[PDB]
Amino acid sequence: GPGSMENFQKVEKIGEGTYGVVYKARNKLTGEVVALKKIRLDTETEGVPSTAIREISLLKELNHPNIVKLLDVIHTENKLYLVFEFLHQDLKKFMDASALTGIPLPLIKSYLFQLLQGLAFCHSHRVLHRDLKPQNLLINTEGAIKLADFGLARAFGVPVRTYTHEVVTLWYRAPEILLGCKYYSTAVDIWSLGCIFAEMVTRRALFPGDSEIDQLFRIFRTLGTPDEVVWPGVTSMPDYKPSFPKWARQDFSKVVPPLDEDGRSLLSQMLHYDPNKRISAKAALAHPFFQDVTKPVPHL
């Protein structure tokens, strides 16, 4: 687009992603701080990676305050530079930094509200994120949180077709993916955000499995093993097994003890087994939990 690498000053490494390394850089003419994501095509024998083709094409169309902004793509014959707006930290680092303080509830509530705004915008624009986890959520000094890393995102059709199985980092992966369902939809992103909600409150992952089966068993032990009543069709699903242990559903008051009635209500609707009953990001915006929501700066 309207860019060149001579006008950028490298500041420091900030990360490494699917394409190599992300740098913090500074536009020497405007002062703007950016993140550069270098996509080496010289080390590419299949030309431009499909990950990059999706990331760029999808991010171009997603203009929203709670989605990271792709400012430009600089095309060289051997190299591709993605220029993003710079954000200071990811939510994972912020949670670790908030270790023994806790994250104050106003900030959890603000962050969840913004994440829902961002995700609703994705889903309204036929985009599934498919890798929502705290490492992929970026925060600034002004109180904003934004969806980032669209490297696994995909443009969907209505109704959805079969897409890539085994998307979503394991701890954030929805039961319908774990059970090998032919179809998944926008409900997978809500499941991830639900796990993230719980994690913002406790500072630890809700379902930290070591395997697909251990992941599922962890979910089952918290929310109860799903049957045909809670989730019609579950017993038919490709990787459903009748030998699965049948754990009783525990009271959600014990799943995240510090959460108030409203919080619990919302969390429960995000973590509903049945993808059809799980709350949408659009509808979640109206949940009573957000009645008193504000947008405070981070505390650190």
Partner: protein
């Protein structure tokens, strides 16, 4: 209903309606192309259909590729000996966008019978991405069709398959189809398929959704009706052959209606 995204299907439809106008090719591009013609484009698209069948690509992939080709050809003058290079790179980009398992680049070189090198395919890939500025998430005929299919009372596989065949037929013939939007060809194809199979018409419910009436679809419908009647005689036959397959309910074997009463 989550597979049909109830909370988002209207937002999505509205958004595709906006995007289809932005992703539209220049209706008269072929007149400004000195060395290629509607006829050569027909040959290319027909080939892409075969390639899609050969590698078991989604239909959506084929439609994306055609979108990429017509938009590139809208701003880039191309010699006839390079038309197939544009097409191959278009199919490669579409595959990486849309497919779980795109074919390797080598396979794309292979299907061109070593007319082009791997280096040429990849160089063209970059060129196409530069000209389109990575605007690859284009609305297709298929993306509208699959939403319209939700309005059937009840769902009918033959109606669905016949609508896809008809929409695919439109990809072949830049004249007249370049002048219609994906959402309008999809509407024509859906009405025509529904009429052929069940005798029914474009439903009220889709008038509500799209704003389109049989009145507004009439011109496109008259084109599509003629394409359907003439399809057995068309120089390009790959789509008819494809839609003989049981995967698509053999719908190319159905007889077009002689008249529409429209």
């Amino acid at each position: 209903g989550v597979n049909e995204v109830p909370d988002y299907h209207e937002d999505i439809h509205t958004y595709l309606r906006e995007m289809e106008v932005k992703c539209k090719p220049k209706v008269g591009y072929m007149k400004k192309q000195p060395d290629i013609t509607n006829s050569m484009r027909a040959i290319l698209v027909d080939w892409l259909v075969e390639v899609g069948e050969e590698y078991k690509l989604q239909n959506e992939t084929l439609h994306l590729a055609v979108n990429y080709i017509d938009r590139f050809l809208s701003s880039m003058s191309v010699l006839r000996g390079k038309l197939q290079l544009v097409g191959t790179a278009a199919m490669l980009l579409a595959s990486k966008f849309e497919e779980i398992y795109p074919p390797e680049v080598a396979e794309f070189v292979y299907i061109t019978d070593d007319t082009y090198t791997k280096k040429q395919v990849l160089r063209m890939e970059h060129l196409v991405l530069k000209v389109l500025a990575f605007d690859l998430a284009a609305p297709t005929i298929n993306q509208f069709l699959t939403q319209y299919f939700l309005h059937q009372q009840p769902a009918n596989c033959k109606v669905e398959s016949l609508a896809m065949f008809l929409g695919e037929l439109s990809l072949i013939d830049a004249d007249p189809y370049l002048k219609y939007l994906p959402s309008v060809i999809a509407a024509a194809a859906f009405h025509l398929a529904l009429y052929t199979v069940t005798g029914q018409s474009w439903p009220e419910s889709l008038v509500q959704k799209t704003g389109y009436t049989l009145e507004t679809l009439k011109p496109c419908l008259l084109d599509l009706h003629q394409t359907y009647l003439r399809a057995p005689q068309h120089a390009q036959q790959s789509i008819r052959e494809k839609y003989k397959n049981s995967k698509y309910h053999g719908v190319s074997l159905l007889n077009p209606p002689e008249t529409l009463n429209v």
